Design a protein around this ligand. Structure first.
Ligand SMILES: Cc1ncc(COP(=O)(O)O)c(C=O)c1O
Ligand SMILES: Cc1ncc(COP(=O)(O)O)c(C=O)c1O
Ligand SMILES: N[C@@H](CCC(=O)O)C(=O)O
Ligand SMILES: N[C@@H](CCC(=O)O)C(=O)O
Lengths: 335, 335
């Protein structure tokens, strides 16, 4: 309950949502206190990476109300991840309702206003049931559990450095556009090496030729030109469609009145941007001080201070989530 | 118990091996009857594909003895898979001892000589314990269960067809050289699309350019030149180092008097080979009738009969496994 020192680690909450799929259909689902998953030793989730997940947060507002941020988008994306791995899909209704149930049943774990914390929801689908050869599972499990997470920046927006790697987290036409475990497994080694070099994480280029930027490992990448007029973010069929990224893209155009561009960002022309950063649910905009690519270390704005436009986007997107700023129609759902 | 109708599907055997890793080391491991894995809802094996596995067989010889085929090779390979995903390694000692324990305790499930069946072993390692962020698991489980099996892709040197795909199962610098779940997860959709078109599976091409053959996603690929004097197989950092492939590589040279080469095999020069096949533990050389690439279906030898060199490699490989032919030194561990 010490909201203050709360970080991003697992803490067992009271109830989690658990649903089962078998013989063509999902059951109604239920809340359980267990927290332990039980599955066949041959489950495809354990042998053939047939698994996918999502990540969203619930925030308590100053007025005491509770906000769930764009749950519909997570529903949509996990449906696409399920399709990619041949797993049954969940409707917005069942997905949203499961999140609502977990939040409500675990309301006492939602960090109060004042503490920059939040209640992190982890919905996921895994292939289960007896099996041995590579194929889609005969049964599946959909579960949603939550964990309270304290502020990500215990000191305020602070930039960190990323480094490029020869390793690929995804193939040109692989599963990089879906939020599946395999992409993350592949990121373990390079991520470890980056951190062993004192870097927060690595910035993956692009599978085919390692010339343009893809992602940072746990977040999408965005950069702002030198003239602070345009917001640019990579467009690739191998990067995860970050909900935070598309949110900022909208905010940048209708809130900050900036130019928006979904295109390529070559690692050779970083000087074209005055600042850059990583965006994701957990990090919620991580200012990027500098990027190490080979021999040189390229700093965009500051290695200790966040860029001006980055602050705007951040404070903006954050205000909406916590209900301090006016939320765009459709976004945010009251619990 | 009907050995003759055995295919490649899960059948619950009596006992499986289970070992736990925690606080820096593996326990001795034990035998259990369970067959259901119990793990934390946030286990990395479920969310971040931190999992790897092996596949090898035990065989009943005519003289009554039992052969375990090159288990040392599987142990070494699983060490490489583990290393790639930052999972703790298992020594040959514990790995081989685990399979021996499983074979001995489930000997009554070993298909008798005369039935081309075998006892398939499935060793695997998964990251477990409470967790939420992308990182290596705090604990791990190592387990080995067995399943009596027959043919994977038909039986008795009957050729099957394969088809090219735009999809990639692995990246140029990803986890393609390791036996990890993410690779198979990626192959699910394309593998399904192939089976719908009546093909056995997809034969993948290099991720970066799609110009050379990689492997089938469940087997390596090999071909015999038109003059029938040379055995050719692809050399790539993104394909699995198949034990069956290396075995065939050895047999081809030192037993069949063939020339051997590991190199590029362009998909546009299939006419350079009189025969082609897919090899693996489950596959045990599956003759390739033809390969569909775009609108072109290419038959190397026959869509109904195996080539003569393929037949020789198969008889030598299978003869060794079942104890009918002298085994090369080091290959074969009597259970
Ligand atoms: C690889 C990767 N990229 C980007 C994101 C950001 O997506 P979101 O904004 O939907 O959390 C995540 C999470 C991720 O795991
Ligand atoms: C993708 C893939 N390729 C090839 C093989 C063949 O390897 P092995 O001969 O060691 O069984 C396997 C198993 C596999 O899963
Ligand atoms: N899937 C990421 C979270 C992404 C986010 O914070 O939006 C993780 O488990 O670390
Ligand atoms: N490990 C593969 C089997 C490989 C083989 O058939 O040799 C699978 O589970 O599909």
């Amino acid at each position: 309950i010490d909201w203050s020192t709360l970080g991003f680690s697992y803490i067992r909450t009271d109830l989690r949502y658990l649903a089962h799929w078998k013989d063509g259909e999902w059951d109604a689902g239920t809340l359980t206190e267990d927290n332990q998953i039980h599955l066949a030793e041959g489950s495809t989730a354990l042998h053939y990476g047939q698994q996918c997940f999502e990540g969203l947060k619930a925030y308590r507002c100053a007025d005491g109300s509770i906000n769930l941020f764009r749950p519909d988008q997570n529903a949509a994306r996990m449906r696409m991840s399920c399709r990619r791995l041949l797993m049954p899909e969940l409707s917005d209704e069942q997905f949203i309702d499961a999140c609502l149930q977990v939040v409500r049943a675990n309301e006492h774990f939602l960090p109060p206003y004042g503490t920059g914390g939040s209640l992190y929801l982890r919905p996921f689908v895994i292939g289960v049931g007896d099996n041995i050869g590579v194929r889609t599972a005969p049964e599946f499990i959909f579960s949603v559990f939550c964990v309270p997470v304290g502020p990500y920046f215990k000191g305020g927006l602070t930039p960190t450095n990323f480094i490029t790697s020869d390793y690929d987290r995804a193939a040109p036409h692989g599963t990089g556009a879906a939020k599946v475990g395999g992409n993350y497994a592949a990121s373990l080694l390079p991520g470890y090496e980056a951190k062993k070099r004192d870097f927060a994480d690595v910035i993956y280029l692009d599978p085919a030729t390692h010339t343009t930027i893809e992602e940072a490992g746990a977040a999408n990448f965005f950069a702002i030109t030198q003239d602070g007029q345009k917001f640019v973010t990579p467009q690739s069929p191998s990067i995860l469609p970050s909900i935070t990224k598309y949110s900022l893209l909208w905010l940048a155009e209708h809130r900050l009145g900036l130019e928006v561009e979904e295109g390529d960002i070559r690692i050779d022309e970083l000087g074209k941007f005055s600042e850059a950063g990583a965006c994701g649910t957990a990090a919620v905009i991580t200012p990027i001080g500098g990027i190490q690519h080979g021999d040189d270390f390229h700093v965009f704005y500051s290695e200790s201070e966040p860029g001006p436009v980055t602050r705007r986007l951040y404070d903006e997107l954050v205000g909406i989530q916590y209900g301090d700023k006016e939320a765009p129609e459709g976004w945010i759902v009251k619990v």
